[PDB]
Design an enzyme around this catalytic site. Structure first.
Site, PDB file in Angstrom:
ATOM      1  N   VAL A  26       0.950  -1.312  -0.121  1.00 17.01           N
ATOM      2  CA  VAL A  26       0.161  -0.067   0.019  1.00 17.01           C
ATOM      3  C   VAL A  26       1.011   1.088  -0.022  1.00 17.01           C
ATOM      4  CG1 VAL A  26      -2.050  -0.996   0.893  1.00 17.01           C
ATOM      5  CG2 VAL A  26      -0.310  -0.070   2.557  1.00 17.01           C
ATOM      6  N   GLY A  27       0.256   2.075  -0.474  1.00 18.67           N
ATOM      7  CA  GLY A  27       1.016   3.754  -0.450  1.00 18.67           C
ATOM      8  C   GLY A  27       1.795   3.979  -1.424  1.00 18.67           C
ATOM      9  N   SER A  28       1.681   3.116  -2.584  1.00 16.14           N
ATOM     10  CA  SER A  28       2.419   3.455  -3.979  1.00 16.14           C
ATOM     11  C   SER A  28       4.009   3.612  -3.709  1.00 16.14           C
ATOM     12  CB  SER A  28       1.670   4.693  -4.718  1.00 16.14           C
ATOM     13  N   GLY A  29       4.312   3.112  -2.731  1.00 10.05           N
ATOM     14  CA  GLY A  29       5.885   3.231  -2.084  1.00 10.05           C
ATOM     15  C   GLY A  29       6.153   4.366  -0.829  1.00 10.05           C
ATOM     16  N   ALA A  30       5.635   5.566  -1.210  1.00  9.13           N
ATOM     17  CA  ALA A  30       5.931   6.661  -0.510  1.00  9.13           C
ATOM     18  C   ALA A  30       5.812   6.604   0.902  1.00  9.13           C
ATOM     19  CB  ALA A  30       5.184   7.852  -1.089  1.00  9.13           C
ATOM     20  N   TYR A  31       5.141   5.553   1.658  1.00  5.03           N
ATOM     21  CA  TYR A  31       4.685   5.473   3.007  1.00  5.03           C
ATOM     22  C   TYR A  31       5.780   4.425   3.687  1.00  5.03           C
ATOM     23  CZ  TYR A  31       0.566   8.272   3.361  1.00  5.03           C
ATOM     24  OH  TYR A  31      -0.281   9.376   3.459  1.00  5.03           O
ATOM     25  N   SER A  33       7.868   0.645   3.439  1.00  6.60           N
ATOM     26  CA  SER A  33       7.605  -1.039   3.191  1.00  6.60           C
ATOM     27  C   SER A  33       6.427  -1.199   4.173  1.00  6.60           C
ATOM     28  CB  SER A  33       8.845  -1.664   3.438  1.00  6.60           C
ATOM     29  OG  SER A  33       9.366  -1.097   4.717  1.00  6.60           O
ATOM     30  N   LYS A  49       4.110  -2.781   8.776  1.00  4.89           N
ATOM     31  CA  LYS A  49       5.452  -1.930   8.045  1.00  4.89           C
ATOM     32  C   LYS A  49       6.494  -2.853   8.545  1.00  4.89           C
ATOM     33  N   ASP A 164       2.108   9.398  12.716  1.00  2.00           N
ATOM     34  CA  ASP A 164       3.501  10.034  11.968  1.00  2.00           C
ATOM     35  C   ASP A 164       4.046   9.211  11.019  1.00  2.00           C
ATOM     36  OD1 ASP A 164       5.532  11.703  11.250  1.00  2.00           O
ATOM     37  OD2 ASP A 164       6.190  12.178  13.380  1.00  2.00           O
TER      38      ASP A 164
END
Ligand SMILES: CS(=O)(=O)N1CCC[C@@H](NC(=O)[C@H](CCC2CCCCC2)NC(=O)c2ccc(CNc3ncnc4c3cnn4-c3ccccc3)cc2)C1
Length: 336
Positions: A26-31, A33, A49, A164
């Site tokens: 999930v998160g198209s990478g930006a979040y 692993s 995560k 966060d």
């Protein structure tokens, strides 16, 4: 100890207990692993995560520790909690990978606003919840420092959790963008002000191209610094700069929120205060009249004592990595 299973997901090795199935990135990478999973023990969806390069340096080691120490402490409705923390490692000798499990997020506060035009009932309830979470966090001598819409998770009930994930600029207190010494919890309150304004006006209050542009947009709204404030800046250079960036014609506060509930504007005015010594606290905010409908004192708790003493320590990776293992093995899930 549970049975684990290997998996390549985006050239990333994912070893988890088998109770966590259907791992999907999930998160198209930006979040980082992160994988959506299905908790077979409880049949809810979850977020796993895998922590990235967790013991690479002293900084990364100590940061891996703080995070796990923080997540394990947060036991509050309006703050992210830890369902689960695990490592495949059968020992400290082998410890290198850390996984954290939380509720899966359905929408951040950003997504909400894109979806629907919020009412004053919404804005009251949402801000009440942020200030409640902040009251808890502040009690533990924890400052968020990066409150922004993308760090606010909001469910089908418009229930809200502070977290966060790691533009910050828009919501950042002015003392931080000027690199002043003194730093209190109310940096977060500034951010709640910025966020609430956005929910009222539907536009970024201080949409600043750079930090200097940002500070201009702030100072034209919250006034050229008062006698009181300037009498707390040490450097001639800083004082001349702050009053040098307050040379945009001043703006009228309530003009910027024409249409808003005056009780909301009243609250905004006590949050967006230049002097952080005179900016309202989360606990005071909760007692503001704008939260008449929700504010129950007997139901706005403070956190338990949070040992932060590790913050001051200069230690070696193997100390950090060992204190981290301690905390992983000794974790006790919340009840269902
Ligand atoms: C100073 S520092 O250097 O130490 N600092 C570096 C930057 C990151 C900081 N993170 C944390 O310390 C906090 C814990 C501290 C608390 C947070 C609450 C306020 C008080 C302090 N940690 C957290 O708040 C967090 C969030 C998510 C996860 C895992 N869960 C997801 N992680 C990604 N994505 C997800 C989900 C769920 N859903 N999604 C998701 C994403 C996109 C789409 C759909 C779902 C794990 C931890 C740490």
């Amino acid at each position: 100890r549970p049975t684990f299973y290997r998996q390549e997901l985006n050239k990333t090795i994912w070893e988890v207990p088998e109770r966590y199935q259907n791992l999907s990135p999930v998160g198209s990478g930006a979040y980082g692993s992160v994988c959506a999973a299905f908790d077979t023990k409880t049949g809810h969806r979850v977020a796993v995560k895998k922590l990235s390069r967790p013991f690479q340096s002293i900084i990364h080691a100590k940061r891996t520790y703080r995070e796990l120490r923080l997540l394990k402490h947060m036991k509050h409705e309006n703050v992210i909690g830890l369902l689960d923390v695990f490592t495949p490692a059968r020992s400290l000798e082998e410890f290198n990978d850390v996984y954290l499990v939380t509720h899966l997020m359905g929408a951040d506060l950003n997504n909400i606003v894109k979806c629907q035009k919020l009412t004053d009932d919404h804005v009251q309830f949402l801000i009440y919840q942020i200030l409640r979470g902040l009251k808890y966090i502040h009690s533990a001598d924890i400052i968020h420092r990066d409150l922004k819409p993308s760090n606010l998770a909001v469910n089908e009930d418009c229930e809200l959790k502070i977290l966060d994930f790691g533009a910050t600029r828009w919501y950042r207190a002015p003392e931080i963008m000027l690199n002043w010494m003194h730093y209190n919890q109310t940096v977060d309150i500034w951010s709640v002000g910025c966020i609430m304004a956005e929910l009222l006006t539907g536009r970024t209050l201080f949409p600043g191209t750079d930090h200097i542009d940002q500070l201009k947009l702030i100072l034209r709204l919250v006034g050229t610094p008062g006698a009181e404030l300037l009498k707390k800046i040490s450097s001639e250079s800083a004082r001349n700069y702050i009053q040098s960036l307050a040379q945009m014609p001043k703006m009228n506060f309530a003009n910027v929120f024409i249409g808003a509930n005056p009780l909301a504007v009243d609250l905004l005015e006590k949050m967006l205060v230049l002097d952080s010594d005179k900016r309202i606290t989360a606990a005071q905010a909760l007692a503001h009249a704008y939260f008449a409908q929700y504010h129950d004192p007997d139901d706005e708790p403070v956190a338990d004592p949070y040992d932060q003493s590790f913050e001051s320590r200069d230690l070696l990776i193997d100390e950090w990595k060992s204190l981290t293992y301690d905390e992983v093995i000794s974790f006790v899930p919340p009840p269902l």
